[PDB]
Amino acid sequence: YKLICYYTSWSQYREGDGSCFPDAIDPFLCTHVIYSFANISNNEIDTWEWNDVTLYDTLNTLKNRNPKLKTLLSVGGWNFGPERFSAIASKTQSRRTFIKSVPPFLRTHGFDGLDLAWLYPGRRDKRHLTALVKEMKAEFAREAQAGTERLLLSAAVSAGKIAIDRGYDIAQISRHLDFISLLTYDFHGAWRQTVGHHSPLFRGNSDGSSRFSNADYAVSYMLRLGAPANKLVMGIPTFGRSFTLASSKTDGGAPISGPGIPGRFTKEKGILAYYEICDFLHGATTHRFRDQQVPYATKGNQWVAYDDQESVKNKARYLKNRQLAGAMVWALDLDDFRGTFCGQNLTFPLTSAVKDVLAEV
């Protein structure tokens, strides 16, 4: 079983304990670590943060301690406009230039592969996305002729029915990618006013429009669309999503005046790192949807939808029962990498839980 763990570039800037460097990563924890977000300049892959060269290096030494650990660099991201991605993929000229620029870059820094994080291609992008992956893999196959490990090519894909239908030629890109990571944790309406859990495992028999909004359906759909189970990786969030309640109503369906307040170290509205959540729980009321099998917490006018150890173990067992390729964690930097915020002196609580389930069989 594969355990793809993303590490985000900008997590170094977090104050105090929040600050996380490749340095703090357990070399034996995951099987693949993806460095989060590289840019594209002059239609050529390029760095993002000033000290990326240094961090790329910090991260790629972990392989000295664990020969088998494989690393990948991811292009795109949320702060990377799909428009610009879209423009690179439409002109066969821009596309080829970008492609040709990757292997050298990757080789130079020590990455064993590239991860496409084109965050959501539109209906007019499907055709080109397919082109992009085909040629990419083709270039990697050619470069491997030079007598060296072939680079890996993976992609972070949306897990919403509509999104998938709109911009992905799954059956096609499936045969060219090494593995696909399902963003199975962006399910609850980033758009509207009611409390809701962003990463439900099952359907939640109470509500009936939006079933397509859960891990199960997403995975089933992908398999139906033609993606081989041995290539699917279900994404598991290591963070929670926050909401500022608009009424004393807390139960499912409650009103929302807007996103929750920022975390001391995360400093971002609506989001909370798991270690921040561990501190939040103190004086908070824990609740859990049996239907979807995920928990949520409330304190004051703050409502938090998140994943805990069992929640994540539960998803891990799911993934296993459908015989998927493995799991993908959202950031390693959002988990308790210090192990000093969530009791139990364990480091990387969440990601470990997944590993335990993934390894006990």
Ligand SMILES: *[C@@H]1O[C@H](CO)[C@@H](O[C@H]2O[C@H](CO)[C@@H](O)[C@H](O)[C@H]2NC(C)=O)[C@H](O)[C@H]1NC(C)=O
């Ligand atoms: C992202 O790539 C862009 C593309 O060049 C870099 O942002 C630049 O992008 C603008 C949009 O095309 C250019 O017009 C500007 O010349 C340029 N910005 C500056 C200040 O020079 C960008 O720097 C890359 N991202 C990062 C984080 O460096």
